[PDB]
Each structure stands twice: as C-alpha cells, then as structure tokens.
Amino acid sequence: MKTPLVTREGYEKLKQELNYLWREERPEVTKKVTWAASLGDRSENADYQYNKKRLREIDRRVRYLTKCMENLKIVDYSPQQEGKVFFGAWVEIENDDGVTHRFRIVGYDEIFGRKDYISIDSPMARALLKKEVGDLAVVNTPAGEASWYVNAIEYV
Amino acid sequence: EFDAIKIALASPDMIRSWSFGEVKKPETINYRTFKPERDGLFCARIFGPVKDYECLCGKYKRLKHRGVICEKCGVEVTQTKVRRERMGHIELASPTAHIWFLKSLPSRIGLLLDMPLRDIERVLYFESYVVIEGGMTNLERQQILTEEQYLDALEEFGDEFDAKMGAEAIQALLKSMDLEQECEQLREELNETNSETKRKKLTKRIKLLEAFVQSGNKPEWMILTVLPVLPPDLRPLVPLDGGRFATSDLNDLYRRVINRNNRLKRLLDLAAPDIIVRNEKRMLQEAVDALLDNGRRGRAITGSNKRPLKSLADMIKGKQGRFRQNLLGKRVDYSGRSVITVGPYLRLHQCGLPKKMALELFKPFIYGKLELRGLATTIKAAKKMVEREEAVVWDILDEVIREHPVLLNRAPTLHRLGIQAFEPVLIEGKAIQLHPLVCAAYNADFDGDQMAVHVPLTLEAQLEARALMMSTNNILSPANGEPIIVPSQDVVLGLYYMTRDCVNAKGEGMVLTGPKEAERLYRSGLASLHARVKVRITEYEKDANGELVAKTSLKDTTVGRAILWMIVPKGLPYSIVNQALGKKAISKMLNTCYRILGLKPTVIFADQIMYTGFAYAARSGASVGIDDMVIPEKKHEIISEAEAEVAEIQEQFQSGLVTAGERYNKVIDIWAAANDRVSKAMMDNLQTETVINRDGQEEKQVSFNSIYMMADSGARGSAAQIRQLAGMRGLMAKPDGSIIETPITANFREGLNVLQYFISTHGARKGLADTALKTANSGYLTRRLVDVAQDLVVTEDDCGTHEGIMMTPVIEGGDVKEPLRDRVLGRVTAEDVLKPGTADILVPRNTLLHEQWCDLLEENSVDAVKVRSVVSCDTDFGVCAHCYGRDLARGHIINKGEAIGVIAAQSIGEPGTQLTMRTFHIGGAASRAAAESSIQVKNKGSIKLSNVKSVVNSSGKLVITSRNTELKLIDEFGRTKESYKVPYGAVLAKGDGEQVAGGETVANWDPHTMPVITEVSGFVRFTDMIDGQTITRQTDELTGLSSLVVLDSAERTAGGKDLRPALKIVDAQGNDVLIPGTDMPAQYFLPGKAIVQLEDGVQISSGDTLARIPQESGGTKDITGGLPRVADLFEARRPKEPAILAEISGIVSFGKETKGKRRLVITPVDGSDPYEEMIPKWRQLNVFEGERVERGDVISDGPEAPHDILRLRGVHAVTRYIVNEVQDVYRLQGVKINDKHIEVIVRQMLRKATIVNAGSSDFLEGEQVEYSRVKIANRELEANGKVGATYSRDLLGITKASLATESFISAASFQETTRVLTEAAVAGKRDELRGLKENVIVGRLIPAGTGYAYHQDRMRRR
Amino acid sequence: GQNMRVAFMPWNGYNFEDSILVSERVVQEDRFTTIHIQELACVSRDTKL
Amino acid sequence: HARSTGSYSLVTQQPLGGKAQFGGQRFGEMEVWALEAYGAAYTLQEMLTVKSDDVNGRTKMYKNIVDGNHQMEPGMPESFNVLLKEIRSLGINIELEDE
Amino acid sequence: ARVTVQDAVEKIGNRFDLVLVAARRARQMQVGGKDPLVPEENDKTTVIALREIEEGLINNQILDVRERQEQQE
Amino acid sequence: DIVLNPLGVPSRMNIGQILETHLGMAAKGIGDKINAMLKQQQEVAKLREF
RNA sequence: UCAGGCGAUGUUU
DNA sequence: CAGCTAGCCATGCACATCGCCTGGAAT
DNA sequence: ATTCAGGCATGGCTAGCTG
Ligand SMILES: [Mg+2]
Ligand SMILES: [Zn+2]
Ligand SMILES: [Zn+2]
C-alpha cells in the first residue's frame, strides 16, 4: 500500500515545512483563539468556532507529517549503478503514435506537479521497476492495456 | 453544644433502649374516621398525638394536664413535634442477615469467616447446610454440605453431630468464634508466609480483625434480631384531592415486612412441616433485603406501575438523596428572580431593581420602621397598609434601602465571580437593570437570561458583602492576573472610530491651545472628528519620591484623540493613547493604570471610558450595508483555473499515472491552495482599498469599510468570518471524517444550491452533539477537584524553611515559549540571587517579587531561580503564607486565612469546557521527532566535550568513537548551561572550545542505525564471512545495489552457527594489520541480523561506517486524548505500555532466556547484586551491557510512570512533571493558568504515605497513614532520646485520596455511600469536624474566613 | 407578528448586547397587544365534620 | 417573582420550590463553593441556617428584625437531624458527643 | 458616601479583622446608645463604622481599652 | 421604530436579515408611491399602467 | 403537599 | 505452588428554571 | 368495602490456564 522510500531533498523540504508550521503559524491562531475566548457567548459566537476549526485542521496536518518523518526510509543513492530504471531516475517515454512524456520517479510525498511528480505505487512505475533502453512495456489502465517505449535515462 | 460525631454498630439492647413501643399490625388508617389505626404504624400510645396537647380519647386538652398519659387509650400529652424523634421496633421470629454487610464487595462477613461469598449466599437463601461443632466425626467445621449428603450423614450420624441451615447458623458460627487465638495463629502464619498474594489476603484479614477487636464491638451484631422503624413524619402520608392518598414507598415496604413476619409467627404454633417454614423464612429474608436496599439482590421488587419503589439506600445515595439535595444546597427564603436588561446610566457599583420586587422583599424592615415612626399599633394594621400600598410606604422604603447591599446570582455558577454584590437604585418596570461592564464576568448576554437576588439579613453579613464582594473590589480574575473589566463590544468600536486618521478632512493643518477648545471645535461643527493637528498638552509624572511633576509640550496628534485626553487621570504618560486603540491597547491601558495609581482612579476611569465611548459611537453611526462586502474580481478566474487543473488530473488518472487515494489527495491539495489564494486576494482588496486625493494626486490609507472596522477593532469577527462572507467557504468534512472531494465554491452573499447547504448541515449538527457530551464531562471534573482540595486553608505565617524548586524559561530547543519573568512573577524567593558577578548578592533570600524586581532580573540575564513552592511546605494541617506568593486578584501577599483550595479547584476547572474530547495530543514530541537525528543546542555559548574519545576523519569532520562523551554548553562566564548525550559515531560540525551562538544544527545521522565506524583507513576483505553459513546475498529491487544480511543462529547453518563474522582492515596487498600502536589484532566482529553494504576491494577512512545495525523504534504516542488526558493525569492511571527505569545505580547484564519472556539483572558497585526483573524482549532496549548508569535513569521508552518517578527521583521531579504536562495540554489550546493551582492540587494528591521500619513508633509495618500525623509524631519522638521512623510517600488518584481521609462524612457526601458508611461502621471511627464540608453540613461557622478568627478563639478556649 | 420600520445603528448603549429598543409610536397603536385567558376552578368537597 | 416568608414543606422544614407554589429560589452547591471562595463566612452561615432550616431560628430572627436588633442565633439545622434518623433506621448507631 | 474600603485595608492590613472590628463597633452603635464620633450624613451604622475606621481612630486596641474602661464600674 | 445592534450581524453569520431589510424597503416604497397616486385621486388608467 | 412522565427555556463543539 | 489473564460485575454520567398531566384490582 | 430487550470507561474481583 505504501513505501517508506523517500528522497533526501524532499525529506529536508518536508522537515522545513514542519518547522515552519510549528514555529511561526500555530502561535498566531493561538493568540486569536485566546482573544476570542474572552468574549461572552460561545454558542452565539462563530469567531471562536471557526478559529478552533483552523486549529483542528492544522493539527491534523502536523500529526500526519510527524508520523511520516518517523517512518521515512531514506535512500540518497548516487548514479553509482546505472543501466536499468529502478528509482529516482529521469525517464522519457514515447507512444508508437507521437505522444511523448518526460518525468522523474519519486516517492509518495513528492507529487505536486512541479519537478518530479510520479509515485511508485502507480501501475506505470510498477511496470517499470527495471527495464532496458529500447524495450516495450505495457500497463493496465481502467480502459484497457497500453504501450510505450523508453528514450533516455539520467539519474543526476 | 457539641463536638466530633461518633459512629458504631448497634446492639439489640441499644435498640430496645431506643424505641418507645412495638409494632404488631400492618394497617395504616381508617379511610373512614381519619383518626389513625390503633397500635400500628401510626399510634399515639406509641408515637404520639396529632393535635397539640389533645389526647385521642378526648379527655384532657389544656396545658393544665401537661405531661400525663391517658388511661382509656394511654397516650402522653406533648407538643406534636415528638413524632419527629420517637422510634419503633419490630420482633422478628427468625434472625435475619443484614445486607450491607453481605454484598458490599468486599464481604465483611465473607472474609471474617474465610468463606466463599457464593456459598454464604447459598446458606442465607436455604439451599445447603453447614456444620457447627462437628465433634469427633468424619466431617469438618466450615464444611458446607448438600441435601442428600446431609440426609446420608443424619442416617449415619444423627447423633450429637450438628449442622444447620439459615441465618441461625451464621449466628451460631460467629458467636462461637473467638478473636485472640485467631490473631495469634494468623501472625504465626504471616511470619511463615512466602507468597505475596497470600500475604495480601492474610494482611487484609488481620487488619480487619485487629481493628474489630480494638473497637468495642461483637461480630454477631452484624445479624439483625430487631429491626427499627423510621419515625412517622419522615414517611409522611399526604392526602390528595379525592378520597385517596398518595402512596409512599417506605410504608409499603414496612407493611410487607410486617405481614410476612406475622405469618411466620402464626406458623410457629401449628408446627407445620418444615418445607413451608423454609419457604416462609426465605420470603422474609428477601423482604428485609428489599427494605434495606431494593435493587442489590436479583430483580428488584416494583411498586405501583413499573418502577423500583425507593428505599432507604436511595434516601441517602445518589444525586437525589439527602446529601446533594438538602444539606449542601438548601432553598432559601428572602429572595426572588427576574429578567435582566441594560441601563447604561449607572456607575458600576450599583444596579437596578424593581419596586414591586423590593416591597415584597424587605417587608420585615418596612414593618419595623413603620412601628418605629408610629403609624400603626400592632403588626396587623401594618400588614394591611403594606398590602393596600398607601403613600408613606414608598418613602419608608427609600429610607431603608439607601445603603443596604444585595447579591446577584446567575445559574451556572462556575468561578467565584459568579456571585457579586451591588447597591440598589429603584426602577420602574419589572426587570433588573445591570451595569454593562460586568456582563463579561458573569458570562451573561442579554438574550433573555435570568438572575436571582439575595438579601443578607444580619449585620456581620452586610459588612461581609460590602468589604469583600462589592463589585469595585474585583478587577482581576483569580485565575490569572489579567483584568476582567475589559470594555466589551460596542464601547470598543466607539473609541476606535473616535481615534484614527484619514489623510485630508475639514480643519486639517491648524493649531489648538488645548483639548478644551478642541472639543469646542468638534461640537460647533467646523472641524472633522479626525484630522491630524499639532496641539499643546501637559502631562504629569511621579518620577520623584512618590511625587507628581508636570511637563508640557507640542505633540502631533488627532483632534478626537485630544478629546479623549480629557478623561485620563493625572498620572499616566501620553503615548498610551496616541495610536489606533484596538482592544489589546485599551486592556493594557487599564492594566497600567491599576499598576500605577491604586484603585479609585481606575474605577472612576473605567466609568468615564464607558460613557464617552457610547456617546461617540452613537454620534458615529457605523452601520452595515450589503454593498460593503466586496467580492474580488478574480474569484471567477481562480475557480476556473482550479477546475482546469482537476480536469488535467482526471485525464492523467484515466491515462494511468495515479491511484485512487492518489487522485483524492492531489485534488484536495490543489483546492486548498486555491482557497488560500482567494483569501489573500479578498483581504488585500478590502483592508487598504481606500485610495483618495490629498490636495495633491493620491495616496492610499487604511479603509473605512464598516465590516473591516468591526473586525480590526476587535469587536466581533475576524479574517475567518470575513472570509466566509466573501471568499469560498472551504471544505466540509462528513460524519465518517473523510473530507469530501468537492469544495463549496459559493459564499453567503451569493446563493447556495441545495447540496452545499445540506453538507454544511452535517457539520453543524455534529458540533452540537459534541457540545452536549463535553459539557457533561467538564462538570464532573470540576466537582471531583473541589472535593479533594476542600480541606486546605492558609493557617500560619512562615514555615521558615530552605527548600524549593528550580524555574527556568521554557524553550522548545529553538524559540522560547513562555519567559522566566512570567513563570516567576509573584511567587516568592527561596534563596538569594547572586548577580553573575559571582560572590555578589543581588536580592535577599526571603523577598517578594513585583514588577520592578522582575525588570531587575531581566536586566542581568538571569538563568534560573530557586523559588519556594507549596508542595514542600513544613506546616501542620495547613500551608504557610510566604510559600504561596501573591494572591492573584489582589496586590499584596495573601492574607492569613483566605482558603485557596477551592479557588484553585474552580480555576483549573472553569476553562475546561474549551478543551476538545477525541483528538490526539501531540504537543509532547513535535520537537523530539524534529530533532532526533540532529542535536539542538538551546542557548548561546561555546561547545564543551566530556570524556572525549573521537577522531577527525580524512573527510575533515570529527566523529566520536564512544558513548563516554557528553555535550556541555559553555557560557561567557565558565559554567555549564546545557547538557546533552552523545550518539555513537556522531557528526561534529563544530569543535571543542569553538565559541558559537545558540540554536544551531551541528550533527546528523540515521536514528535507525548504529554505525560500524573504523579507526583508520584501509581495505576490506571477507574475513570470516560465508554465504548461507553466516550471511545471505539478498537482492534489493528498489535500490539497484543489493547487500549482505546476517543470518542469525536461529536461521543459519549449524557448522558455522557460532562463527562470528569479522572484518579486518588491510592494505592494498593484505598484510597483517593490528590496532594502530598496539600489538592487538584489528578485526571488528559483527552482531546478528545486520546489513553490510560494502564489499571486497573497497577503501574506507578513519572511522568510516562499514555496516549498518537495523534499529527499530516505535513512537506510538496515540494514547493522548486531551480532556481525558487531564482526567488521567489527576487520576494517576498507569499508561498502557509503561517505560521501565533503573532501580539503583550499577552495571547491567542478562540472565535466563525465554521464560515466555526474557530477563534482566543489575549489580551495584558494592551493594546487594541479585536484583532482576522479567522484560518482554520484544520491547526495544535503549541499553547495552557495558553501560553503567545511575538510579532512576531510563532504560526503555514510552510514557513515564508517575509512581516510579515519585518513588525514585524526587517529589520536586514528580510535581514538575505533572505541571509541565497539564500546562502544555492547556496552553496548546491557549488558556492562561498560573501554575500555583496545579501545584496545590498535586500536593493534596500525595497526602498519604506508608511505613518501612517501625523504629520506636506505634504502628504496624505494612500500614498506611497520612504524612502529617507521622511527621508530627516522630518529631516529638526525636525530641527525646529514641529512634525515628522510616517512611515513603506514595501518590494516589484524587478519586481515592478523597475517600481515604480521616473524616468520613466528607466522603459520605461524595460519589458513593455504602462503601464508606460500612467501613466506618465496622471501624468505630471517631471523626472531628476539622474541615469545611463538615461544618457546612452541621451549619456552624467555617474555618475559612472570619471563621478563622472564630475557630482560633475556640481552640484557645481549651 | 407585524412588520415595522427598523434601522441598524448603535444608540447610546441601550442596545448594548442584543437589547432591541422600541419607540412609543409602537405601544400607542396597540400593535403588539396580546390577549391571554386563564381559567380558575373552585370545588365543593363534602368532608366529614 | 419574589418571596419573603411563605409556606414550608412538610418533611424537611425547608421552603418550597417553584412559583405557582408561592416559594423561593435555590442556593446551589456551586454557589456555596463560591461563597467559600471568598472569605465570607457569616453570609454562608445565615444563608443555610437562619433562612432555611432552624424553626426556632427563623422565629427568633423575625422577632428580632422587627425591632432593629440585627442578630442571628444559629442553633442546629433540621435536615441534618433527619439524616441522623434515617441512618439510625439501619443497624447503625450514630450520635453526637460530649460538649 | 462609600464606594471602596481601600483606606481601611491600609490602616489595618488584614482585610478580614476589618469585618469583625466594624461589626463590633456597629453593634455598639445600634443596640445600646453610645452615639457616634463623626458628623453623620443620614447614613446607616454600617457605613458609619467603616468611615470612623478610615478616619483612623478606631481599632481592636481602642475597643478593648474602652470596654475595660466601662467595665471599671 | 426599532433600532437593533449592528455588531450582531457579522458575528452570527446570518447575512440574510440585511437583504430582507432592503427588499422590504423596496416594498414599502412601491406602497407609498401608490398611496400618493390614490390620495391625489387620479384616473384609474394611471394605476393600471403603474 | 410527594413521586414519576412529558414538553419547553437558558449556559454549553 | 505463582504469575498472569480473560471474563464477569459495581459504580460514575453539570446546573438552574417553567408549564401540563396521573397516582390499586377483586370481593 | 376489606386485602395481597440499541451506552461508555473504568476498576475491582474471581476461576482458570502455564511452570
Ligand atoms: Mg444567553
Ligand atoms: Zn386518651
Ligand atoms: Zn512553607
């Protein structure tokens, strides 16, 4: 279902985001709630209500990120061994019809469309844990099977 | 009149001494001639007459015959009261087993006989037999028996042999039993015991026995022979409208018992067959059981319709017995209630009241002043006048109210503000008028609430109400030092709009000689209410030796602001009112005012602020208009792009690059980002939207949009609410908790299609249900707390000690959360404080700490302070003054007597409703996990090593080769401020003595692997390494490279089952490499199930990581809940998987393996070695063998057990633990609470203790007793030439330390009754008053306030 | 109920928290007057004596 | 609503409850906590002795009020006396003691 | 003519013995004679006593003194 | 005739009553206009069109 | 004047 | 003969108010 | 006109199974 495999750059980025949330964001909403509490009503008030909701939502995020940071297996592996396509690799694939794609394969937490946005648990990657340049590889989409071909690989 | 109550059991002699008569017949009354039945449950010749001094026979009817009984019916003449005291009894033919002594769990009888409760039941319900005096026969004494066995035995030994069945048998048993020989033999056995559970049972039994002997009682009395009946009145027989009577319960029950008894009595004449009389006795036993406690045997007997009729047990138990219904809170005369309204023309030490309510209240006073001024002879004409409501009465009422304070109360009284005082001022209408500036302390809006009045009667009472509860004398909540007279919600908008600035309005650019002519301009209407102006103002300052001095100048300010200036009293600076004046501003305004100019100025200043605020707010007129909530012109396009993005992601899904939850999270994240963009957009489009000309071109400024003012002031609502009025209202969870996957792209200004409103309904309803249940638990918590700290009163002045605790500013490794000044303010010094000019004392050792001393501390970078706590006072029965610090809500030190327990309890309880209920508290590892792999220094200073054993690799970094090292933080002085462990093979970015700053990451590693660091460089061979035999070559897909995994003894082959895999450094050729300098070989030997990554032909460095130790660690801290976390912390529950610790300092080793679990052993340096303990080896081990540590140190991880913490580290340690924990649980939700109160609760938590050695004392060894008693004992013991006593303090949960108290009525009014009353009864436990709740019960004074003077005089009496 | 002319603005405190204010122009025309009816009962028992 | 001196219940000589029955308010447990919180004591005393329970108490109180002399005389409550009787109903022996 | 008791608290630093002292003086003024020692202002004995306290010429000491002086008889 | 409290509106997020107020204002506007047109008694055709 | 049922009004995520 | 150990009971569950209604079946 | 069938959390305890 999951894989603790994560890349070190994203690891650092995530830790920094954690520190950001826990230092310079929590206390401001904290002050707002401490303020709003001094008002009289609580069931006839909504400011306390929605500010508390904000706290709950940020708490859930910090909980998730905490458990992650606990269970993150890091592999900051170099281009030392190369020749197949196993992890942390740039990959070009093309269709037999003209469709092309470029992407890097990373772990679950690194998918937000910016640079390297594909998770290993996806069938695409699952059909590519190790291949050779110039080979067919098929996947099983909900609309049937597909096909592409490799073009090039550069680790880093 | 009396003193300490006493309680014990009852003898038949005692009862027959009690009663005056005897019951025979079950009838109640005639229903025909409502004279009562003869010689039954209402009989004068037993109980007493009905009409005063008139016999039922109708012969004597006047006091002339007072005191003589009748002769035709024989009834004593006496006041009708007596039917509230006399009592009656009943003759039971058979004996009867009382039930409290039978099913209290434990069973008193049960362990008295050392007999199973099941069989004892079997006996008391006639389905067995039991032997008495078996004699020289085949059988035993306690030997229970069955039907056919009894039959056979009687067939064979119908002789002197005797066994019986039924209550008579229990009675014969007990009466036969002795106690002296029992105690002797049991003490013998306890000397001869070796099994702890056996010891536990036997010690409970021996305690009960020896107590039963010391007290003057006889066991057989636990079996009723004569049952007493409750007096008549207390079971009244009320007549209803109609020829019927409201049936009670006790009547029915007694009647049932008496019927059954009379039947059995009749049966013992015909000598009927015995099965019949057995069924009879069984009925009677069950009936008496019903009368004493209906509902503790099987299915409870019902009454009229469907429900268990109420019995005496219920008379006392429950939320509706006598205690919590008629002795702790009584209804009260002289009162009334009504609805509230506002009336802002009042000075805050007076409140409205309606004429009709008054004229109904003070009727006595009116009567009195009437017959004083001589307007009516007797009381009759007086009452007639005050009903007819003629003229003079109203003048009289004005004269009698003038200065006679009253009390106002609101329903859910939480904290001691919940009752304040006022002076009346008569109003028309019919609804109490109440000042505005208190509707925050009452937590009372004007939506139709109700308030109650109360009128003190006596004179001491008036003076109490004026000198302690009058409203002026409460400007600070005792919870925490912030003010409570905070102006609330309109007045703030007022002052706001009154002080601000535009860029260009009328009258700009002129000069004014004084605030006077300023106001004059603004009234005449030739100058705007706000426009920046240079004016002259004069201010005062008391910089001299408490002396005021003036100075004047030309400030630059705003006209309105000048107008505000005419209200500030003499002594403030000017900058306090030269800004926006939001809510925080005005709050600290009042605060500084109170800190600098006493009290009267502050009161009068508060009143003037409220007036002028309302005035200028009205003159302002800040409405709200639908065209004043501007939707930004970009909402449309942003939602458009969001939809485009989710379309792209859906295309990628059906193209096959993502999974289900993958799409889920992707979508939800991009919507959240869009939400934030929209929020920022609207906030910028409002807050500063106003752009205008200046007499030049343009310049923007803060806006005049009504809603933004009503928010930025601090009146009501904020960024969140203006969001939900302008931007999209985010996402909405569903009952499952699974957040829904389509946001609500609408907002309250535009419309809503159905589904969206529907989902929002989901949310709201769940919210309401949680409100209800959470309220419940909060109330229960408050109650429990106040019933444990109730008995603590500041009783002396100076304990005169030298202990204390250490306070340091709380820092999370990085930022400081709460500063030392705030954690120290008010609490009083323990020792002296030498300046960091060491050997130079700054402040004396026994001084108070006010704000000037605070600043003096700040100006010298004070590290930590040793301060006097409460938890370590040295007082008998009390808590000394200095050790308690500033009583918040007052300036100076606490007074000699003000109870603190109760206010502490209420404060820790009140905010409780704000906590959540079901979340996961993770305030305890946010920084832990964030700093596992990287050591975090806290403060500035150089880096110091302790027992270094390290080397700098060829990479240019210093790595350590042993655990012996420790980290210290050198200061600019030469001491040690911070200390840290040293992970094996750590990474040192800095060095030793290298002066650095604070808060810098200088280390890194994998917190899941111990390195296999080398000593020097070299090459690696496969020394003592065989695949299959020793290791395995597992392929690693997701890394490309694979590794070598160690195969343990349990899995590997047998021929190399013991071969230890090794690694010897070599050169390029492979020559013999020793340890550098020494002749000893240099191969490292590998542990089991490790991961070697490197292979043959590899170069390494001086301390390079060769292999890796797979290190598992579970941080399952999911136990944390929140409010139940508070519950459990005051409960002292043992957590689920407790972390074990170090008993005593010494070295460690292992022992037997897999006795289901593994073992552990520890040997001291020179002490008793054999200590061991079973560990489930599946738990992680943070320990190695060759590691020698100190007592109380940690060995495993997880929660930290309060019990062990107490018994091993120190009382200071345990109290610091609890305070940090509970403080964090609160402060995460943001509610300030000074720590004193949590401290005092903890104190009451640890009030008991246990013994170790008898010494010369007068106690049993394995005995429990209160600390204070034994301390005062052994103190006077050591006073003379004897040996002291040895003891150990032990921590108990509140729901226990309540019960296990010297007093008992305290408990009996708390959470259960049967347990306490029974234990006390068998104990024969005398009980002095000595507390609060007792004296509230019995109604005399309280040893808390004025009562303190009174009780000291009383104690001096003797 | 009835429909009345209304205006949103603080006015000298009297509407401090939620306290509606009402002008005599209302209590004159009797446009909130209500009618209530209670019902009282006396009985005639026949008790001995 | 308001009450000065009206009826009295029959079992426990306390004032009644509600309005239709011409009774008075209720002085709740948490309010007793509050008054203990302040140092006020005499107020609490006559709040749950002179105005509620002692029959002789309030008769004396009334007769003294009508003539200026503001002064109570506590005596013993009565609901407590009832508690004594109902515990004594059982096999227990509870008592007061020497003066 | 009284709003706060601060000056009284000052002149007797207890804030409790204040109550008893005031009550005692008040009973003296209400039950039996012994006219007050300050120009009254149509005000009740309670306020009268607090006022004569803050004037600073009454406390427990003087009370016992004058009681003894009466009992001299 | 009645003067509520403005600060009550943003707190209790019920923006509705403000719209209700406006629309009512429009209503009574049409009303008073008709009342004038009728009191200054006119030909019915004007009322028809209006 | 007692006990229960029912409903309703307040404080109360 | 001892250390759990799972399964079965006891006891606990905020405060204040107002209105209405109904109080044994067989002989 | 007399008479006899929707809870939870917790703690305490008792048979009952492994060494
Ligand atoms: Mg309300
Ligand atoms: Zn007679
Ligand atoms: Zn002390």
Curated annotation (Swiss-Prot), chain B:
<feature type="modified residue" description="N6-acetyllysine">
    <location>
        <position position="968"/>
    </location>
</feature>
<dbReference type="GO" id="GO:0005829">
    <property type="term" value="C:cytosol"/>
</dbReference>
<comment type="subunit">
    <text>The RNAP catalytic core consists of 2 alpha, 1 beta, 1 beta' and 1 omega subunit. When a sigma factor is associated with the core the holoenzyme is formed, which can initiate transcription. The rRNA transcription and antitermination complex (rrnTAC) consists of RNAP, NusA, NusB, NusE (rpsJ), NusG, SubB, ribosomal protein S4, DNA and precursor rRNA; S4 is more flexible than other subunits.</text>
</comment>
<dbReference type="GO" id="GO:0031564">
    <property type="term" value="P:transcription antitermination"/>
</dbReference>
<dbReference type="Pfam" id="PF04998">
    <property type="entry name" value="RNA_pol_Rpb1_5"/>
</dbReference>
<keyword id="KW-0240">DNA-directed RNA polymerase</keyword>
<dbReference type="InterPro" id="IPR012754">
    <property type="entry name" value="DNA-dir_RpoC_beta_prime_bact"/>
</dbReference>
<dbReference type="InterPro" id="IPR042102">
    <property type="entry name" value="RNA_pol_Rpb1_3_sf"/>
</dbReference>
<dbReference type="GO" id="GO:0005737">
    <property type="term" value="C:cytoplasm"/>
</dbReference>
<dbReference type="GO" id="GO:0003677">
    <property type="term" value="F:DNA binding"/>
</dbReference>
<dbReference type="GO" id="GO:0048870">
    <property type="term" value="P:cell motility"/>
</dbReference>
<dbReference type="InterPro" id="IPR044893">
    <property type="entry name" value="RNA_pol_Rpb1_clamp_domain"/>
</dbReference>
<keyword id="KW-0046">Antibiotic resistance</keyword>
<feature type="binding site">
    <location>
        <position position="799"/>
    </location>
    <ligand>
        <name>Zn(2+) 2</name>
    </ligand>
</feature>
<dbReference type="GO" id="GO:2000142">
    <property type="term" value="P:regulation of DNA-templated transcription initiation"/>
</dbReference>
From Swiss-Prot, chain C:
<comment type="function">
    <text>Resistance to the antibiotics salinamide A, salinamide B, rifampicin, streptolydigin, CBR703, myxopyronin, and lipiarmycin can result from mutations in this protein.</text>
</comment>
<comment type="subunit">
    <text>(Microbial infection) Interacts (via flap domain) with Escherichia phage lambda antitermination protein Q; this interaction renders bacterial RNAP resistant to transcription pausing and allows it to read through termination signals.</text>
</comment>
<comment type="function">
    <text>DNA-dependent RNA polymerase (RNAP) catalyzes the transcription of DNA into RNA using the four ribonucleoside triphosphates as substrates.</text>
</comment>
<comment type="subunit">
    <text>The RNAP catalytic core consists of 2 alpha, 1 beta, 1 beta' and 1 omega subunit. When a sigma factor is associated with the core the holoenzyme is formed, which can initiate transcription. The rRNA transcription and antitermination complex (rrnTAC) consists of RNAP, NusA, NusB, NusE (rpsJ), NusG, SubB, ribosomal protein S4, DNA and precursor rRNA; S4 is more flexible than other subunits. In pull-down experiments interacts with CedA.</text>
</comment>
<protein>
    <recommendedName>
        <fullName>DNA-directed RNA polymerase subunit beta</fullName>
    </recommendedName>
</protein>
<comment type="similarity">
    <text>Belongs to the RNA polymerase beta chain family.</text>
</comment>
UniProtKB/Swiss-Prot annotation, chain E:
<dbReference type="GO" id="GO:0005829">
    <property type="term" value="C:cytosol"/>
</dbReference>
<dbReference type="GO" id="GO:0009408">
    <property type="term" value="P:response to heat"/>
</dbReference>
<dbReference type="GO" id="GO:0001000">
    <property type="term" value="F:bacterial-type RNA polymerase core enzyme binding"/>
</dbReference>
<keyword id="KW-0808">Transferase</keyword>
<comment type="similarity">
    <text>Belongs to the RNA polymerase subunit omega family.</text>
</comment>
<dbReference type="GO" id="GO:0044780">
    <property type="term" value="P:bacterial-type flagellum assembly"/>
</dbReference>
<dbReference type="GO" id="GO:0031564">
    <property type="term" value="P:transcription antitermination"/>
</dbReference>
<keyword id="KW-0548">Nucleotidyltransferase</keyword>
<dbReference type="GO" id="GO:0003677">
    <property type="term" value="F:DNA binding"/>
</dbReference>
<dbReference type="GO" id="GO:0071973">
    <property type="term" value="P:bacterial-type flagellum-dependent cell motility"/>
</dbReference>
<dbReference type="GO" id="GO:2000142">
    <property type="term" value="P:regulation of DNA-templated transcription initiation"/>
</dbReference>
<comment type="function">
    <text>Promotes RNA polymerase (RNAP) assembly. Latches the N- and C-terminal regions of the beta' subunit thereby facilitating its interaction with the beta and alpha subunits.</text>
</comment>
<dbReference type="GO" id="GO:0030880">
    <property type="term" value="C:RNA polymerase complex"/>
</dbReference>
<dbReference type="GO" id="GO:0008023">
    <property type="term" value="C:transcription elongation factor complex"/>
</dbReference>
<dbReference type="GO" id="GO:0036460">
    <property type="term" value="P:cellular response to cell envelope stress"/>
</dbReference>
